[PDB]
Amino acid sequence: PAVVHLQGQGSAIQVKNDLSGGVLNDWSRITMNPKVFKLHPRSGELEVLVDGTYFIYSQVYYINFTDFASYEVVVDEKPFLQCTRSIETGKTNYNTCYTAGVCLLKARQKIAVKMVHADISINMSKHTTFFGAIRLGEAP
Amino acid sequence: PAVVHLQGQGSAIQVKNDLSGGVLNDWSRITMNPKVFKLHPRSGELEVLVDGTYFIYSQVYYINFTDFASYEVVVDEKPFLQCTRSIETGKTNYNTCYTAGVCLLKARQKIAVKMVHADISINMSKHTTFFGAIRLGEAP
Amino acid sequence: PAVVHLQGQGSAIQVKNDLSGGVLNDWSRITMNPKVFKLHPRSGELEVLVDGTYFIYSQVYYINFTDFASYEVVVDEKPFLQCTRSIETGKTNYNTCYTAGVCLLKARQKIAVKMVHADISINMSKHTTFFGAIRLGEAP
Numbered sequence: 001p002a003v004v005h006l007q008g009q010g011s012a013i014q015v016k017n018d019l020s021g022g023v024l025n026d027w028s029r030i031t032m033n034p035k036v037f038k039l040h041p042r043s044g045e046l047e048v049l050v051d052g053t054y055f056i057y058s059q060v061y062y063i064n065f066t067d068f069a070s071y072e073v074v075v076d077e078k079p080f081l082q083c084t085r086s087i088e089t090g091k092t093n094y095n096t097c098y099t100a101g102v103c104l105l106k107a108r109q110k111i112a113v114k115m116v117h118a119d120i121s122i123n124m125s126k127h128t129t130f131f132g133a134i135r136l137g138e139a140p
Numbered sequence: 141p142a143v144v145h146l147q148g149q150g151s152a153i154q155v156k157n158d159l160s161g162g163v164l165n166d167w168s169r170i171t172m173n174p175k176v177f178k179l180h181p182r183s184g185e186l187e188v189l190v191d192g193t194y195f196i197y198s199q200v201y202y203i204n205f206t207d208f209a210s211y212e213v214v215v216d217e218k219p220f221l222q223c224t225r226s227i228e229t230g231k232t233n234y235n236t237c238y239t240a241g242v243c244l245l246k247a248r249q250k251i252a253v254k255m256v257h258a259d260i261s262i263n264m265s266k267h268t269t270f271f272g273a274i275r276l277g278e279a280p
Numbered sequence: 281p282a283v284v285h286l287q288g289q290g291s292a293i294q295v296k297n298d299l300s301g302g303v304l305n306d307w308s309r310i311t312m313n314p315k316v317f318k319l320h321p322r323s324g325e326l327e328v329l330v331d332g333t334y335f336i337y338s339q340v341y342y343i344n345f346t347d348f349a350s351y352e353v354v355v356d357e358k359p360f361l362q363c364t365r366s367i368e369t370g371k372t373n374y375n376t377c378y379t380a381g382v383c384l385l386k387a388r389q390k391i392a393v394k395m396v397h398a399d400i401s402i403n404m405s406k407h408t409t410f411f412g413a414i415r416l417g418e419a420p
Contacts, residue, residue: 001333001416001417003333003382003384003416004382005381005382005383030383031382031383031384033420053141053143055274055335057380057381059379059381061362061364067229067231068234070234072267079266079267080267081199081267081270082201082236082265082267082268083236083238084201084234084235084236084268085228085234085235086228086229086231086232086233086234086235087228087229087367087368088228088229088230088231088369091229091368091369092366092368093228093366093367093368094348094364094365094366094367095364095365095366095367096362096363096364096365096377096379097236098238098363098378098379098380099199099236099238100197100238100240100380101145101197101199101270101272102143102144102145102171102272102274103145103170103171104171125362127352127359127360127361127362128362128364130361130381132381132382134335134382134416136141136143136274136416137141140173193281193283193311195414208374212407219407220407221339221407221410222341222376222405222407222408223376223378224341224374224375224376224408225374225375225376226367226369226371226372226373226374226375227369227371228367228369229369237376238378239339239376239378240337240378240380241285241337241339241410241412242283242284242285242311242412242414243285243311244311276281276283276414277281280313
């Protein structure tokens with residue numbers, strides 16, 4: 001199996017003005033098999049270069065937000081996974097938010113972590129905020 | 141590796157009165173290997189057809205509860221995994237609860253996601269509530 | 281693929297004690313490929329016995345906490361993953377805290393679950409608190 005583990009590079013992000021369309025992008029590729037995965041640095045996309053059965057996972061560290069914190073893991077712009085937290089307006093929620101799932105992908109398909117449009121702050125520390133995949137094998 | 145990723149059928153559920161024994165059901169079967177896995181949609185049970193080493197995972201999107209929200213991933217009615225949340229707010233508790241783990245299984249054993257009996261609502265959207273398994277290989 | 285699923289053996293721990301630097305060691309070794317994995321019962325370290333690509337996961341059940349509840353998954357004492365909850369609610373909080381990720385490892389390296397030192401309680405039940413890994417295959 002080929003793998004990729006992408007880590008945030010540190011520094012806090014406010015989702016509204018510190019990102020465009022909510023998409024996380026400045027990922028550090030500490031592990032990436034270049035024959036199976038390609039990273040797109042501005043669009044924040046993790047592209048698969050071959051058909052396969054893929055396990056996909058992510059985790060975003062919510063560090064303070066208004067009331068509703070959430071993101072989607074999208075595949076070709078389509079919601080596949082979601083991780084969501086809540087809090088009462090005036091109070092604080094520091095919270096790692098992990099989700100993961102398995103799906104069949106064809107070559108060139110692109111995966112991305114997209115924050116929902118809200119006032120939400122996230123910490124990009126490498127241990128709390130990450131994004132990865134495992135090609136478990138061929139697709140049927 | 142044979143995999144299965146069951147997605148909810150796009151509906152908000154009130155656990156107490158909309159499920160039987162808290163068991164999430166009416167799963168949509170997008171990707172399921174028919175030689176390893178068999179689905180029982182109304183029961184909500186996922187049956188393994190062959191012995192093996194299985195990674196099992198699940199997410200439930202909690203959308204309303206005032207006390208506790210908890211579920212168990214059960215194998216023949218025995219708890220294997222458990223995901224739990226207490227309230228994050230006095231208003232509306234939007235919160236996804238993911239859990240996963242590896243276990244050995246025998247043929248004809250059945251897995252289910254079983255809510256604890258309480259005043260809980262859930263969003264059964266395809267990207268928010270899901271239930272899957274990976275046959276990594278044989279069991280030793 | 282070689283797997284390991286370690287489960288807590290029940291009861292609870294008061295994290296304020298800071299025994300063994302917060303490193304959890306209550307692990308029951310239910311499934312463990314002995315050719316790839318070794319558990320040290322006193323230190324709580326999970327040692328890989330061969331080089332390879334490893335998916336590592338953990339869940340800790342925070343049962344009584346008020347401010348920050350956090351833990352790290354460490355590799356040779358170096359943080360790799362982190363799971364964190366500080367939910368300001370006015371009452372005591374109860375959350376399971378799952379995280380996971382993939383990394384390449386050499387033989388003899390040791391993985392542990394290290395609680396950050398806090399006056400919280402964690403429940404060590406076998407269904408709510410666990411620690412595991414999948415050797416996906418050889419590392420490139």
